[PDB]
Design a protein around this ligand. Structure first.
Ligand SMILES: [Mg+2]
Ligand SMILES: [Mg+2]
Ligand SMILES: [Mg+2]
Ligand SMILES: [Mg+2]
Ligand SMILES: [Mg+2]
Ligand SMILES: [Mg+2]
Ligand SMILES: [Mg+2]
Ligand SMILES: [Mg+2]
Ligand SMILES: [Mg+2]
Ligand SMILES: [Mg+2]
Ligand SMILES: [Mg+2]
Ligand SMILES: [Mg+2]
Ligand SMILES: [Mg+2]
Ligand SMILES: [Mg+2]
Ligand SMILES: [Mg+2]
Ligand SMILES: [Mg+2]
Ligand SMILES: [Mg+2]
Ligand SMILES: [Mg+2]
Ligand SMILES: [Mg+2]
Ligand SMILES: [Mg+2]
Ligand SMILES: [Mg+2]
Ligand SMILES: [Mg+2]
Ligand SMILES: [Mg+2]
Ligand SMILES: [Mg+2]
Ligand SMILES: [Mg+2]
Ligand SMILES: [Mg+2]
Ligand SMILES: [Mg+2]
Lengths: 257, 207, 153
RNA sequence: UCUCGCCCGAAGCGUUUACUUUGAAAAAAUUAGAGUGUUCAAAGCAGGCCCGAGCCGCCUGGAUACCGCAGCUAGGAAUAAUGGAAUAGGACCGCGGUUCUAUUUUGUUGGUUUUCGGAACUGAGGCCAUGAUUAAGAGGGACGGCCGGGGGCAUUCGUAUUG
RNA sequence: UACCUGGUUGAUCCUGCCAGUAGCAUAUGCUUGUCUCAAAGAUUAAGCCAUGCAUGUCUAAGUACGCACGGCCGGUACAGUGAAACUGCGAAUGGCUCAUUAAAUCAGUUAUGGUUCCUUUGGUCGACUUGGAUAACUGUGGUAAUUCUAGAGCUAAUACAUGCCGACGGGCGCUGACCCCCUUCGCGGGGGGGAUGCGUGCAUUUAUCAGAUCAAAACCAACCCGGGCUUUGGUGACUCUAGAUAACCUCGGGCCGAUCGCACGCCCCCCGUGGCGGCGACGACCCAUUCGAACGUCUGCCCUAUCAACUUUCGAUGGUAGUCGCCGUGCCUACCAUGGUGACCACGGGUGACGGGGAAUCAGGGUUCGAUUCCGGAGAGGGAGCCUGAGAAACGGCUACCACAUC
RNA sequence: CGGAUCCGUAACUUCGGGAUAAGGAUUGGCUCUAAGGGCUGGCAGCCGACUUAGAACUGGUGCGGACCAGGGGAAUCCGA
RNA sequence: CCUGGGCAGGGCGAAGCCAGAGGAAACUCUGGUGGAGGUCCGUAGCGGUCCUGACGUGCAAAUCGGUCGUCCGACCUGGG
């Protein structure tokens, strides 16, 4: 090919957008943004498909450019501005407010938390550096660059970030015994306590997690988002602690009805 | 026209590799500007990513650094000896990244004066010029300050530079790419490498 | 020694050693790099004389990625030798294996002295040092036999 | 090993793979397959409830498996190769002597001399139950008494044939 | 559906094949009422094309003196719909086909510490308005004609350009006239202070210095108290990020706003001829980030020995510098060494070979296709070169040749 | 055509040849550069041979400049 | 038959030898050294093919000019 692509096929769309076969040939390709396309979620899919706010796609383009939808406190003019894990979606004229977390199966869900939690947002530290004249800098997976954060922030930590002023408040570090949530891989949407991490010099460390009722998984560092401080979640979480049940437990739940 | 592609080569073994591209865009090879020593002339070249890169057809000035005493002065380039990679470019007078250059010794004379009084290389003339040397007379403790600089550290240049400065020329190796950045930067040879290259130049005058 | 047109790595040679005027040792300006990864730097890199642009313990050649193993075949090529990795390729049809090998030419640092043909050697991935060489001799393991034996003269 | 925060955390941390059991990891669509009355079915991913319009509404799903081989991770040591100590240039503990540097402390700066911490070099011992699986109805070779139209070279004999 | 039957012989048993059997996917005959889905000039020709269409674009927020339309509208330029043109951005995605291509593309694995990156999203963003030039338009022509343009006159701007104010001076960097005390007769020594002068910011390119893991004395030379004190970050690793110093900063010349819309109110004051200007749209050096891209590491490919030795003056393998390139590299130059692969199938031919995810075929194991809707590669008649642009060796862009072919 | 240098050389065959096969290119003048040695001293200093390779400049395509100097292939008959 | 005399330069590159690579052996491959031949181009020499050239009462009772064959040999040649 010649330069960057500019489309995306409906079949080539990722699985968790819950898109259909017979509908159309083209998937919405999300805009270039602060989240990768394998992990993102388009606004046209969010308003159109799941919430059933708008039947057609064009109605979403009408309402967003009539300024009803804001992301992280401010209005995004785009119809396909990409979202990400742990982002604030607020809606102004109708009293409604949304949070993006993961279902136990691996999908985005609806979580109608209040304006008190609209104020507060979590985020993961990507890396840390120093710039001009000896000042520090922290980089977020949400592509926030913030200077003078703290001296006591490790690379793989979690910062609670404010969307009013954009300045940090009340960080939390990475330690054995913290409650984390999985954002990637085959076990996404799993919430559990970090048990034991193994460090390899081969650039990819592993982490074992346990949760309530003792089931244990394992994953890699970039798939990990620290959510709590010693089995205490900072943010309310949908469907219990979001534990994956079993195939048999899902069947028995739907038989219990 | 020139492409520097690796796919027109043979293999690890030596079988002929079949072509299947047509010398695509991202493997441009531009013709080389043989950088002469004339008065300053630099063209621009549009480069992938929009970054401006500079061809230097001929350069005169250059930024050079004395080794030990840490001096750095804008200085004219005089003569080019012993490229040591291709002896054609010696006679062609072409400046490359590793090339050895004679440099006018004058812009280090006034520095060595102004920081390091009782200087060197004045042809043992002793009546020549008004060297504001002794005129200032160095009243306060600044005289003792300059004397600890001049004779306690003793400010000696290990012969090799005495004989160059009384002939008024200096050997420096280039350390930048004139065809790429448009600047003839470089550092002055000192001691071991200096007597090494002087031995090679004397062997060049021999055979 | 330098018996070429120039060899001098990075370290500044001339610390104006005439402060009293003296002969002295002059091996002091030697660059010294740890590769890390728990693999010990040999002491030939500490007290050597060689200046190598492509040595992993003296040059700027970083080490990353994969770590493989082979056995030394030939040494005829200057500062770089040819290793041979045997393995067992599986076939699903017949449901048993066959031998295959792909000769790798690898850059040999001259610190690893006495490196006799036949020893198991360990290599690491690098940036492309040359046209056919992409690996680097990380750690020489064995002498392949007995060191101890001695013959007549 | 208790250096690091009686024991663990941590760390030496592997002779080295083949082999297994994990666990990640990966892309969908296809195949298997869960749910669902597309009027059935091939399909599709939907739909289902109360409410006599009035709840300016609720519940739930869009599963899971499979993904050769190669690469990563940790258990298992049987099977099958490899490692060590035989001219000792072993193993382990404790000394001598040479030689080299690192940062703390002598209120502070510097110098002189150390203790010391680490590498190396060297010599002297004591110590180990001090070190070599046994000899395949595998094999090689020595051996010694015979054996055979076995091979080659030379010699001798015999009729007969033909002249 | 873990499946056989007839056929050599006068008759039997048997090796062996031939033919019957069932799918699938291309064509074809006869026939055919409904309804739901549903492939389709891939195979021979990646041969030739008549015609008509397939890429254009405007907001309260770049440029309105259009001849078009008319707001109420009198005049202090401008409201408004706005054709046309300049600018900006996109035409490099999509769509089609599979002729080349056999560790080559590809599929998995990984990393760029060896690189580029328009856009989006953040961070950094410390002279009451200067200069010409042009299109639309006006007239005026040319040729058989094209998206043909000449000359004459007019005007614009976020096209091009030029270029200032603020602003305090800081303290360090090196100079530096000069100053306070002690000793000494002075000379001199020792200790502690200071007008000017030249530089300075981040990017650009060199060079040098500083750079962390542990803890007690014996002295002597100087002298601080009430015998006793001074210390950037990260990976497994750096020449990384960051500091400190000496200079450079390229006339084809990096940054440091002479842009634009909405809302109109408030303050001091001496008129507002000054402030306080909240809210937005644009872009600009770099750092991230996102989309990728490119070259890398390992492993895997069909048939063929009537293809067993091949590679090396015009690179075959490596070493040394360097040019070139975004960077790493025999990518190219010069010198030097004589190397590299192979019976574990090299090299060379063939393919009616694009590669995979997949499809058909049912005990199990396989065998045969994969032109084709998804991933990736390649090419627009062959083949070569190139401008613009972040991004092309682009072909619904350009230049020449060859082969066609129009007026 | 003809010398020389650098490439490349078939059919056939008694495997020695064919073979300078066939077919190409280059060749001047002038500046250099690189390589090829001897004799001395406890790796360094003095003294020399005529050859080869490469580069630039340049002459009105001109270069074995005169002299020197193999046309070649395909076949048949006969005789080694 | 005896006795003496004489023959410029070069191209082709066998035996023998050396080194390197391969092979288990047999031996093979590659680069040199080596200088054999009733051997190849060619000088003197010796012959005399063609031009059926010059001459043809000539220079001459067999010559001349080009073009030619062979030159380490079964070679050429004087005297006895
Ligand atoms: Mg495309
Ligand atoms: Mg000379
Ligand atoms: Mg049949
Ligand atoms: Mg066509
Ligand atoms: Mg790619
Ligand atoms: Mg590619
Ligand atoms: Mg070359
Ligand atoms: Mg084909
Ligand atoms: Mg089947
Ligand atoms: Mg099967
Ligand atoms: Mg495709
Ligand atoms: Mg193309
Ligand atoms: Mg196109
Ligand atoms: Mg012939
Ligand atoms: Mg002849
Ligand atoms: Mg005949
Ligand atoms: Mg004859
Ligand atoms: Mg002959
Ligand atoms: Mg002949
Ligand atoms: Mg002749
Ligand atoms: Mg003759
Ligand atoms: Mg004659
Ligand atoms: Mg005659
Ligand atoms: Mg005659
Ligand atoms: Mg006649
Ligand atoms: Mg006559
Ligand atoms: Mg002859």
């Amino acid at each position: 090919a010649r330069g960057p692509k500019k489309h995306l096929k409906r079949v080539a769309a990722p699985k968790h957008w819950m898109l259909d076969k017979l509908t159309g040939v083209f998937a919405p390709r999300p805009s270039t943004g602060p989240h990768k396309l394998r992990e993102c979620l388009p606004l046209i899919v969010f308003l159109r498909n799941r919430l059933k706010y708008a039947l057609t796609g064009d109605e979403v383009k009408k309402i967003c450019m009539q300024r009803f939808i804001k992301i992280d406190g401010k209005v995004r003019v785009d119809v396909t501005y990409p979202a990400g894990f742990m982002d604030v979606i607020s809606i102004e004229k109708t009293g409604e407010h949304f949070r993006l977390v993961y279902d136990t199966k691996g999908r985005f869900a609806v979580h109608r938390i209040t304006v008190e939690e609209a104020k507060y947002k979590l985020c993961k530290v990507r890396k840390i550096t120093v710039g001009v004249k000896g000042i520090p800098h922290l980089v977020t997976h949400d592509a926030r660059t913030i200077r003078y954060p703290d001296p006591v922030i490790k690379v793989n930590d979690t910062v609670q970030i404010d969307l009013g002023t954009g300045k940090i408040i009340n960080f939390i570090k990475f330690d054995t015994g913290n409650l984390c949530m999985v954002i990637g891989g085959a076990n996404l949407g799993r919430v559990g306590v970090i048990t034991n991490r193994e460090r390899h010099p081969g650039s990819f460390d592993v982490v074992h997690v346990k949760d309530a009722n003792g089931n244990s998984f394992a994953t890699r560092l970039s798939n990990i988002f620290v959510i709590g401080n010693g089995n205490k979640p900072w943010i309310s979480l949908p469907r219990g602690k979001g534990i994956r049940l079993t195939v048999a437990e899902e069947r028995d739940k739907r038989l219990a009805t | 026209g020139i492409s520097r592609d690796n796919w027109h080569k043979r293999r690890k073994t030596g079988g002929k590799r079949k072509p299947y591209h047509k010398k695509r865009k991202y493997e441009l090879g531009r013709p080389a500007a043989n950088t002469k020593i004339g008065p300053r002339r630099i063209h621009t070249v549009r480069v992938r990513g929009g970054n401006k890169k500079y061809r230097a057809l001929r350069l005169d000035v250059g930024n050079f650094s004395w080794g030990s005493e840490c001096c750095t002065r804008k200085t004219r380039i005089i003569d080019v000896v012993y490229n040591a990679s291709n002896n054609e470019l010696v006679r062609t007078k072409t400046l490359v990244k590793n090339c050895i250059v004679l440099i006018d010794s004058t812009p280090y004379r006034q520095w060595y004066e102004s920081h390091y009084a009782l200087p060197l290389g004045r042809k043992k003339g002793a009546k020549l010029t008004p060297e504001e040397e002794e005129i200032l007379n160095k009243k306060r403790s600044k005289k003792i300050q300059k004397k600890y600089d001049e004779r306690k550290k003793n400010a000696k240049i290990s012969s090799l530079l005495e004989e160059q400065f009384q002939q008024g020329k200096l050997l420096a190796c280039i350390a930048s790419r004139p065809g790429q950045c448009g600047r003839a930067d470089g550092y002055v040879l000192e001691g071991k490498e200096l007597e090494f290259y002087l031995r090679k130049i004397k062997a060049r005058k021999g055979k | 020694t330098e018996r070429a047109y120039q060899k001098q790595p990075t370290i500044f040679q001339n610390k104006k050693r005439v402060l009293l005027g003296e002969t002295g040792k002059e091996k002091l300006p030697r660059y010294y790099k740890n590769i890390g990864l728990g693999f010990k730097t040999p002491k030939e890199a500490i007290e050597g004389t060689y200046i190598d642009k492509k040595c992993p313990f003296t040059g700027n050649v970083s080490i990353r990625g994969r770590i493989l193993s082979g056995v030394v075949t030939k040494m005829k090529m200057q500062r770089t030798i040819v290793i041979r990795r045997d393995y067992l390729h599986y076939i699903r049809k017949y449901n048993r294996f066959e031998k295959r090998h792909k000769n790798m030419s690898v850059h040999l640092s001259p610190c690893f002295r006495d490196v006799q043909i036949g020893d198991i050697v360990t290599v690491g991935e690098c940036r492309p040092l040359s046209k056919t060489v992409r690996f680097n001799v990380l750690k020489v393991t064995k002498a392949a036999g007995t060191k101890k034996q001695f013959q007549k003269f």
